[PDB]
Amino acid sequence: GVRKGWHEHVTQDLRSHLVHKLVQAIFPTPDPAALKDRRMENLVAYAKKVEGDMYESANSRDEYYHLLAEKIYKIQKELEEKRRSRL
C-alpha cells in the first residue's frame, strides 16, 4: 500500500473534528452540555466507527472527507421524510 498526503496530514485532533462534523449534521447542538449526554454518545459510537472505513477505502483527501460528507447529506434525507410526509 502506497501512502499519500492525507495519511501524513490526518491527526488525532482531526478525527475528533470529523466526528464533531458528523454529530452536528445528525443533530445540531443547543447547549455544549448535550455532548456529555447518554443518548448523544450512542450515535457518537456510530460516527466513531465510520472514520476507519474511510481509511481503508479512500486513497485521497478529497475522497476520504467525501465519504464522511455523503452520510452527512444522506442522514439529512431521513429527517426530511418525517418532516414533509411524517413517515
Binding site: 448535550a34 443518548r39 450512542n42 477505502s57 452520510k71 418525517k82
Partner: protein, 33 residues
C-alpha cells in the same frame, strides 16, 4: 476483478436510520422536559 465490494446490504446504512429517528426525539425531550 471486483474494485472492493463493501460488506453490509439493507442492514449497512439502513439499520441506524431506525435509531436516528428514535434518538432525535429523545434529544428534544431532554432539553425542554
Amino acid at each position: 476483478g471486483s474494485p472492493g465490494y463493501p460488506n453490509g446490504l439493507l442492514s449497512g446504512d439502513e439499520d441506524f436510520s431506525s435509531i436516528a429517528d428514535m434518538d432525535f426525539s429523545a434529544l428534544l425531550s431532554q432539553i425542554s422536559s
